[PDB]
Each structure stands twice: as structure tokens, then as C-alpha cells.
A paper describes a structure:
pmcα-synuclein (αSyn) is an intrinsically disordered protein that aggregates and forms amyloid in Parkinson’s disease, multiple system atrophy, and dementia with Lewy bodies. The amino acid sequence of αSyn can be divided into the N-terminal positively charged region (residues 1 to 60), the highly amyloidogenic non-amyloid-β component (NAC) (residues 61 to 95), and the C-terminal highly acidic region (residues 96 to 140). Here, six residues at the N terminus of αSyn are identified as regulators of amyloid formation. In accordance with this role, the first ~100 residues of αSyn bind to membranes, and alteration to the sequence of the N-terminal region can impact this interaction.
Accordingly, a deletion variant lacking residues 2 to 7 was generated, named here αSynΔN7 (note that Met1 is the initiating residue and hence was maintained in the construct). The results showed that under the conditions used, αSynΔN7 forms amyloid-like fibrils with similar yield (85 ± 4% and 87 ± 5% for αSynΔN7 and αSynWT, respectively), but at a slower rate than αSynWT, with T50 values (time to reach 50% of the maximum ThT signal) of 23.0 ± 2.5 h and 7.2 ± 0.3 h, and lag times (Tlag) of 18.6 ± 2.4 h and 5.8 ± 0.3 h, for αSynΔN7 and αSynWT, respectively. Whether deletion of residues 2 to 7 alters the architecture of the fibrils formed in the same buffer used for the ThT experiments was determined using cryo-EM. After 2D classification, a subset of twisted segments displaying a regular ~75 nm cross-over distance could be identified. A structure could be determined from these twisted segments to a resolution of 2.5 Å. The αSynΔN7 fibril core was modeled from residues 42 to 92 arranged in two identical protofilaments with an extensive, buried interprotofilament interface involving residues 50 to 58. Hence, despite differing only by the presence of residues 2 to 7, αSynWT and αSynΔN7 are unable to coassemble into amyloid.
Author numbering:
A (entry chain J), B (entry chain L), C (entry chain H), D (entry chain F), E (entry chain D), F (entry chain B), ...: 42 to 92
Write the structure that this text describes.
């Protein structure tokens, strides 16, 4: 029995001349998440979560 | 028995001359999530969730 | 039994002439997460989470 | 039984002429996380988390 | 039984003419984490976490 | 039984003409962590954590 | 005056589980040409030409 | 005056589990050309040409 | 005046579990050319050419 | 005046578990050319050419 | 006037568990050429050429 | 006037568990050429050439 969970593979990306500006005064800001994998057996699991 | 859960593969992207601007004064802002996979056995699981 | 959890592989990326600016006055800012894998047996697990 | 958890492999990246500027006055800022793997048997586990 | 946890391998990176500037007045700033692996049997485990 | 935990291997990097500037007035700044592995049986374990 | 001739850029490709078989007994066979650029000021110029 | 001729840049490719078989008894076989650039001021110029 | 000819840069590739078999009895076989640049002022210039 | 000819730079490659077999009985076989640059002022110039 | 010809730089490669077998009975076999640069003012110049 | 010809620099390579076997009965076999630079003012110049 082969089981795969939270697997990311074979990703090819090319970014050229990309400009990003973030200004924060309060609270939380989350950005630019790429090729992220996570497995949580128990408990709350969050990815790129801003509260 | 082969089981796949929360699997992302074979993604090819090309971004050229893309401009992004974020201004935050309060609260939460979430942006730019790509190729993200997550498995949660128990508990609340959220992806790119802003509260 | 072969089990894979939270696995990232075969990622090729090319970034050319990318400009990023972050200004923070309060709170929390999270950015630029790439090829991150995590497994948590118990307890809350978060990736790129800003509170 | 072969078990893989929180494994990252086969990552090739090329960054040319990339400029990053971070200005912090309060709070916490997290950025530029690449090829990071972590396994936590018990307790809260967080990656690139800014509070 | 072969078990792998928190393993990073086969990473090739090339950085040419990259400029980074960080200005800190308070709080905590974390940046530039690459090819980091950690296993924690018990207790909270965090990677590149700024509080 | 062969068990690997917190293992990093086969990393080849080339940095040419990279400029980094850090100015700190308070708090803590952490940067430039590469090829770091740690195993903690008990107690909190943190890598590149700025408080 | 900015002049570009025979320029290829921003190509991202992902090939997974592709099988190719070529059997040749005479003549010429040409295949699998990708991201090829050529400029010839004088004389015959051919790309992936089988005679 | 900035002139570019026969220039290839920003190519990201990922090949996984690709099988190629070539059997030759006579003549010429050419295959698998990637990211090739050539400039010929005078004379015949050919790329991946089988005669 | 900045002139670029036959220039290849910013190439990131990842090959995993690729199998290649070549059997030759006569003639010429050419394969697996990557990131090759050539400039010829005079005379015939050929890349990966099998006669 | 800055002139670049036959220049290759910023190449990052990762090959894992790749198998290659070549059997030759006559003629010529050429394979596995990577990151090769050549400039010929006069005379025929060939790269990975099998006759 | 800064002139660059046949220059290769910033190459990072990682090869793990790669197997190569070559059997030759006649003729010529050329393989495994990496990071090779050559400049010929006059006369024929060839790289990885099998006749 | 700064002139660079046939220059190779900034090469980092890691080879782990690589197996190579060559069997020769006649002719010539050339393999495993790395970080080789040559300049020939006059006369034929060849690198890794098998006749």
C-alpha cells in the first residue's frame, strides 16, 4: 500500500522582472508562498494564514 | 491500494513584468498562494484564510 | 507499505531582476516561503502564519 | 516499510540581480525561507511564523 | 524499516549580483534561511520564527 | 532499521558579487543560515529564531 | 536602437513519464529540439534539418 | 545601441522518469538538443542537422 | 554599445530517474547537448551535427 | 563597448539516479555535453559533432 | 572596451547515484564534457568531437 | 581594455556515489572533462576529441 499525502513535485517556474511592494501598519500580511507541503496528525494546521 | 490526498504536480508557470502593491492599515491581507498542499487528520485546516 | 507525507521534490525555479520592498510599522509580515515541508504529530502546526 | 516525512529534495534555483529591502519599526518580519524541513513529534511546530 | 524525517538533499543554487538591505529599529527580523532541517521529539520547534 | 533525522547532504552553492547590509538599533536580527541540522530529544529547539 | 534577433526567453517546461523510441536503418533522423536560437549573417542556416 | 543575437535565457526545465532509446544501423541520428545558441558571421551554420 | 552574441544564462534544470540507451553500429550519433554557446567569425560552425 | 560572445553563466543543475548506456561498434558517438563555450576567429568550429 | 569570449562562470552542479557504462569496439566515443571553454584565433577548433 | 578569453571560474560540484565503467577494444574513448580552458593563437585546438 503506497500512500502519498501533502506531496508537491515537478514544479518549474520562471519569474522575470517582477516587482512586489508591501506596506504594513497593523495586523498581519502573508504573501509569496510557493511549493509548500504540510501534514498534521492532530491539532489545527494552517498555511499562509493571517489573523 | 494507492491513495493520493492533497497532491499537486506538473505545474509550469511563467510570470513576466507583473506588478503587485498591497497597502494594509488594519485587519489581515493574504495573497499570492501557489502550489500549496496540506492534509489535516483532525482539527480545523485553513489555507490562505484572512480573519 | 511506503508512506510519504509532507514531501516536496523536483522544484526548479529561476528568478531574474525581481524587486521586493517591505515596510513594517506594527504587527507581523511573512513573505517569500519556498519549498517548505513540515510534519507535526501533535500540536498546532502553522507555515507562514502571521498573527 | 519505508516512511518519508518532511523531506525536500531535488531543488535547483537560480537568482540573478534580485533586490530585497526590509524596514522594521515594530513587531516581527520573516522572509526568504527556502528548502526547510522539520518534524515535531509533540508540541507546536511553526515555520516562518511572525507574531 | 527505513525512516527519513526532516531530510534535505540534492540542492544546487546559484546567486549572482543579489543585494539585500535590512534596517531594524525594534522587534525581530529573520531572513535568508536555506537548507535547514530539524527534528524535535518533544517541545515546541520553530524555524525562522520572529516574535 | 536505518533512521535518518535532521540530515542535510549534497548541497552545492555558488555566490558571486552578493552584497548584504544590516543595520540594527534594537531587538534581534538573524540572517544567512545555510546547511544547518539539529536534533533535540527534549526541550524547545529553534533555528534562526529572533525574539 | 535596441535590436533583438533569434532570442528565446522565459521558457518553463515539465516532462513527466515521457517515452521516446527511435529506430534508424538509413538516412537521417532529427528529434527533440528545444530552446534553440541561431543567427547566420551569411550562408545557409538550418535548424533540425534532416537530409 | 544594444544588440542581442542568438541569446537564450531564463529556461527552467524539470524531467522526471523519462526514457529514451535510440538504435542506429546507418546514417546519422541527432536528438536531445536544449538551450543551444550559435552565431556565424560567414559560412553555413547548422544546429542539430543530420545528413 | 553593449553587444551580446551566443549567450546562454539563467538555466536551472532537474533530472531525476532518467534512463538513456544508445546503440551504434555505423555512422554518427549525437545526443544530450545542454547550455552550449559558440561564436564563429569565419568558417562553418556546427553544433550537435552528425554526418 | 562591452562585447560578450559565446558566454554561458548562471547554470544550476541537479541529476539524481540517472542511468546512461552507450554501445558502439563503428563510427562515432557524442553525448553529455554541458556548459560548453567556444569562439573561433577563423576556421571551422564544431561542438559535439560526430562524423 | 571589455570583451569576453568563451567564458563560463557560476556553474553549480550536484550528481548523486549516477551510473554510466560505455562499451567501445571501434571508432571513437566522447562523453561527459562539462564547463569547457576554448578560444582559437586560427585553425579548426572542435570540442567533444568524435570522428 | 580588459580582455578575457577561455576563462572558467566559480564552479562548485558535488558528486556522491557515482559509478563509471569504460571498456575499450579499439579506437579512442574520451570522458570526464571538467573545468578545462585553453587558448590557441595558431594551429588546430581540440578539447576532449576522440579520433
Amino acid at each position: 500500500s503506497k500512500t502519498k499525502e501533502g506531496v508537491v513535485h515537478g514544479v518549474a517556474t520562471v519569474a522575470e522582472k517582477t516587482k512586489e511592494q508591501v506596506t504594513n501598519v497593523g495586523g498581519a500580511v502573508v504573501t509569496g508562498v510557493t511549493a509548500v507541503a504540510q501534514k498534521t496528525v492532530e491539532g489545527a494546521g494552517s498555511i499562509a494564514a493571517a489573523t
